[PDB]
Amino acid sequence: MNNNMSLQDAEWYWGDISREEVNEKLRDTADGTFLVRDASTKMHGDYTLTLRKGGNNKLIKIFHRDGKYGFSDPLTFSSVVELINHYRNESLAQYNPKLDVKLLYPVSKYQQDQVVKEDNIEAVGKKLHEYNTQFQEKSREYDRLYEEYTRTSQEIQMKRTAIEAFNETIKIFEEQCQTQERYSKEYIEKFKREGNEKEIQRIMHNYDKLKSRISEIIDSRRRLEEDLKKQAAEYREIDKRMNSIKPDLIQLRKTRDQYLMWLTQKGVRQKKLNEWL
Amino acid sequence: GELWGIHLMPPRILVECLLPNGMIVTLECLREATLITIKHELFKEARKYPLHQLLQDESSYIFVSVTQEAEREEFFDETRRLCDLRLFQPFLKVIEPVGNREEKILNREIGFAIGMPVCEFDMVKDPEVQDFRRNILNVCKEAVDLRDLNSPHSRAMYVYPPNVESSPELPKHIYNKLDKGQIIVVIWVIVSPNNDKQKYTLKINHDCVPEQVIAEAIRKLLSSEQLKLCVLEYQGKYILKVCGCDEYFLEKYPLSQYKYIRSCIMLGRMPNLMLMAKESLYSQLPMDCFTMPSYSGETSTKSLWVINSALRIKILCATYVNVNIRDIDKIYVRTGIYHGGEPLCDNVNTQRVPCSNPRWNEWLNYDIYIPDLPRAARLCLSICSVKGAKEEHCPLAWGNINLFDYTDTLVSGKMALNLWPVPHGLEDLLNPIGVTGSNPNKETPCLELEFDWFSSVVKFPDMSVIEEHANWSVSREANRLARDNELRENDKEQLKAISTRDPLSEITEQEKDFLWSHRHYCVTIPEILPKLLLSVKWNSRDEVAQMYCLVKDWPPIKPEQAMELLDCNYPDPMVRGFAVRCLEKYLTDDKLSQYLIQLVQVLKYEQYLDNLLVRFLLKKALTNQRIGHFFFWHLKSEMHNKTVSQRFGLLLESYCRACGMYLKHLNRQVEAMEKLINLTDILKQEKKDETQKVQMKFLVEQMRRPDFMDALQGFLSPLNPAHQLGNLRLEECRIMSSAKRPLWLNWENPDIMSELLFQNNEIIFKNGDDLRQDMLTLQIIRIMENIWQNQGLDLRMLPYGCLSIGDCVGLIEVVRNSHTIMQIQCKNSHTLHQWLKDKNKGEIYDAAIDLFTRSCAGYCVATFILGIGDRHNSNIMVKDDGQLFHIDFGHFLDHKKKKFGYKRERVPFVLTQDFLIVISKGAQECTKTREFERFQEMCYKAYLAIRQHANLFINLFSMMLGSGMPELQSFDDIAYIRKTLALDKTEQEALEYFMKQMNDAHHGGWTTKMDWIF
C-alpha cells in the first residue's frame, strides 16, 4: 500500500518548515530518526532529508529531473515516497558507506492525533487553554523559585567571605595574645621581684580584656556559621523544589505544543488561537 | 557597607587598637576621621595604658586590619577617611611596616580595581594559572615598549588615540553635504589668564590634515613671502583639540576622517576646535612606569597516535544531588565527547540508579579511536533525573573537561569534578557551550571519574608529525593534484554558490563530500574556509591532519569573516590561530572598538588561559587607552560571575599592572560606581515603602556628605572616558519612577570650552535590571546605521551610550531635548504633527518631517529584524529637530516567543495614524500619499541592505552564546534573524515577506505592490 501513497499524505513529510523546526524535532534522538521538508527556495534541489546518526543531524538533498528523484546522478526513484521506503528497508550505506543506517523512526505529523483523540475543535481548544494555564502557572512558580535561588546563592557567598574575614580577625587577636605573653614573661618575672603586684592589675586587666574580646569575636563567627548552614540548607531545599517543577514544566509545554499542532492543522484562525493561549 | 553588616557607619564609633607592646586600647573616633590623626589621638592615650614606655613614636608604626574581602591590609596612605577603608570590623593593628612598600600599594590598587584581592591568585595550585600569571607579562612589557618607542608622540597616542573612521573615503551623500568639497571650522584660543577666548574661523578642504588646518589658523597685514617662516618653524607648536572634549587630533588624517568632524558634517553643525600648546600636553603626560611583579620523568612520553585503544571513561560516584526522592524515580550520568558543539560520536549514559545513592562505577565505552581524538576534544557531562509508560529527563548539574590540558597532555587517572547549576532556561541534558573546569565552589555536587592510564605522559603530536601523516594520507588516497586536475566551471560555480550561504545554514552531506573533494581548489576562493572546515571529519585524524596543512598556508580573509571562526563551532586552535592572525593584520582600532563586546565574550570559549586571542586583545588594550578603557569595563562587569571569575580576574590584573596612570582614573570611576550601588541598594532594601519624596531627601543628605562629594565629582565617564564629569548638580539629580529606582544624574562639564559642546552631562544610573541586552541592541543599531550610510541610505539612528558595569548594574546616556510620545500626546491623531510643527515652524519644517521619516524607517526595519519588545508611547521618543528613536529594548530575538506557543515573527514597531500623519505632512489619507510611498521604499532598501550584511550580525550573535544572556543560550535563539531577513528565501521573496509582515501588522494600511492611479 505504501509506494502509491501521495507525498502529501506521508507522515514524515512536513512541507515547508524551518531547519530550526526540524532541529527541535530531532534534538537528542536515536539514530535512524528522520523527516522530510521542502528544500530552500533559493537552492537547487526539491526536498531535504534529515536523519540522526552519531548524535548529529545529517542533511541530504533530494533532487528531481524528468520524473526521477535521488541524492545524486543518476536519479533512479519514481517518487519521494519510493525513495524513503527503500531506505527504510535498506541501509544508506548503498548511497554512502560512511553512514550505515536505515530510516527507522519517522517523525510523524499525525503524532498529536495519537495524543489528543478528542475530535471537537472547541473542546480541543478548551483543553489547550487549561494546559496553557497550568503551564503558565508552573512557569511563574519556577520563576519565583529561581529568583530566591539566586538571591540565596549570593547571600551565602557574602557570608562565606565574611567567615574568612572573621577567621583572619581571630588569627590577629591570637597573635596579640602571643605578643603580650611573649613580652610579659620577662617584665612580670622581674616585677614580682621589686614587690610590684600593682604592675599586674594593669597588665592583667589588659590580658583579660584582650581574652574577652577574642571570645566575643569567636562567638560572633560561630553565629554566622550556623546562619550560613541554615541558609545553605534553604538553598538545597530550593534546588529540590525546582528539580521537582522542571519535569512537569517540560511535559506541560510539550502537551500544549501538541494541542497547538492539532489545532494549527484544521487551520484555526490565529485570533481564535490567541484567546486560548 | 563601610563596616560589616552596616550600610552606613554612625558618626562616632569605637576602635580596638592592638599595640606591638601587647596592649589593647579602645578609642573614640569620628566616621570622618583620617588615620593620621587617629594615630595621633592614639599614642596620646597609649601612655595611660601599661608598657607604653616601649612604644616608639607614631612615626615608625603603620595601621593594619581586615577588609570586607577578608584580606589583611596595611594602610600606607594615612590621609584616608576611616569610612573609606572598608574595614570588616573596627580594629586596627599597629606595626612597623616591612617589605616592598610601592609594590604593595600597587597590589592593593589593582585589587580595588579588580574587585578581588590579588593575593588570592598566589594561593592557586593550578599550574596553568601561575603560568598565565607569569607568561602574560611578556605581552605587558612588549606593549609598554611600543608606547615608549616614538616618544612622546608614541606616549600621547596611547593616552589620546585618534578617533577615526576606518576609511577616509567619503560616502556620496556625505560629501555632497559639503560646499565644493570644503568645510567651515571654528578654531579657538585662550588669549591670556583673563581666559576670554578668541576665534579664528576657517574654510578649508575636508581632507586637510590638522597641520594645514593649524596653518590656515595663524593666517586668520604683513609680508607674504616670509609666511613660510613660522609655519615651517612653528607647526608642532600646537595641536588640535575638540571643544568640550578630551579628544585630540594627534595623527595625520584627513580632517573628515575623525569621527567628530564626520559627525559634525552629518548633523549640519559647526566643528569647534581649540588650539592647544603641544608642550602643555606632552609634558603633562605621566610617562608612567611599569614594573615587573615579584611572581616573575624517565618514562619517555608517548604520542597520542601511538596509543591503540578505544576511548573509555569510568564514572565512579557523586557526593550528592539535591532531589526529592518522592518526585524523582532515578538518576544517571549523561556524557559526551565534543568538538565545539558537535558530538564526535554517540553520547553515552551510565545505568540509572536511585536518587539516594549516586553510585555507578562503570566504564563507559565510546566508538572513537584514541588517535582520532582531535586537539580541541572535550568531555561534556551532567547528572540527570528521570521521571503513562513515558518519562522526562532533566539536568541536575553539569561540567566540562578538556581531554587535553594546556601542555597538550592527555588527561589520565582519577579526577574529581565539582558541577555547576544549570543556567535558567536550559533544558538540554548536556551543556557543551558552558565553560570547562571544576566549579570553584566545593560545597556542591562532586562527581568522581577515572581516565585510563597508558604508562607514559601522552602528548598530542607536534605539527611536523601531523604534516608527515597528512602527506601519507593524501598519497594513499588515490597535492600537485590541484593543478593536475583542472577545475571545471560547473564546480567553480557550485563552490561560489556554497560560499554565499550564511553561517547558520547547514551544508548537506553531498556538499560536505563535494567540498572535501575540492579542498585543494578552495584556496582560490578563501572566504569558503568556514564551510570547508564544516565538511571535515574532526573524528578522523587523517582528514584533520590534511586540513591543518591547508590552514597553515591559507590566504588571509577579512576580519569580519575571521570573526565567524571565533565562535563555539570552531574550537580547533589552528583555526582560531588563523582567525586571530587575520585580526592582527587587517583589523583597525576603530573596528576593534566596535566589536570589542563580542571579542571579550569569545574569551569564554577558549579552552585555555593562555591563547593568541587574549594576547592580541591585551596588547591592544595596553597600546590604546580608549580600547583599554572598555576592555577593562567589559571584563570587570562580569567579575561577579564565578564561571569567568578566575579568568577575567587574571586578565584584569595584567591590564592594571601595565596600563600605567589610567589605573588611578579607573579606580575613581570604580569608587564612584560603588557608592551609587550602595545608595540604590539602600533605597531598594531599606527605603522601599517610603515615599518618592522621602527617598530623594535621604539621597541628598547621603550624597551631600563630603566623602560622597569627593567620590562623585571629578572623574571620567565610563560611558565615554573623554567626557569629564565635574561638580554634581545635586539639586537637579533625581530618582526616576521605575521599580529599581534609577538615578537621573547631572554633572557639570568642567571643560573651559564646555559651552561649545555641552555644559552639562546627564547619565541614568540603573541598579537592578540587566543592561547587557540593551547594550548589545544599541551596538547592532549603530552598526546598521553604518551599513546604511556607506550604502548611501541616510537614516539617522540614535545608539545612545549604554554600558553594563556589573551584575544588573549599568549606565544610560541621556539624550538632550528628547520626549516620550506620551509626553507629547497627553491631554487626537494630529497632536504629534502639531507638536513638531510648533518646534520647527517656518521654512525648516521640511527638514524635520524628512528627519522624522528617515528615523522611523530605520527603527521600523531595525526593530522588526531584531524582534525587540513591543513599542508603546513610553518606549518611543522624539527630538525637537524631528528625529525619532527608541529606548528600553528589553528582550530581543522574540524571547516571549515561548511562554506562548505562537511561532510567528511580530512587528514591535507599528505605525499608528499619529506617525503616518507626520510622514504625510498632515495629509488626510496618510497611507496613499507620495510621502508614505517613498517612506516604504526607504524601509525596503534598509531591509535589503541589512540582508546583504546578514553574516556580520549572525557572527556577532554567535560570539555571544556564552554570555549568560537568556535571550541567546542557543543557536536556535540566533535563528530568529534568519527568519526576519528570510535568509533561506530568494531576495525578491524576502522583500515580499517583509511587505506581508507589515501589511498584516498595519491591517492593510501598509498598502502593497498593488497601487491605483485609477
Ligand SMILES: Oc1cccc(-c2nc(N3CCOCC3)c3oc4ncccc4c3n2)c1
Ligand atoms: O536602554 C534603556 C534601558 C532602560 C531604560 C531606558 C530609558 N532611557 C531614556 N532615555 C535614554 C536616552 O536619552 C533620553 C533618556 C528614558 O527617558 C525616559 N523618560 C521617562 C521615563 C523613562 C525614560 C527612559 N528610559 C533605556
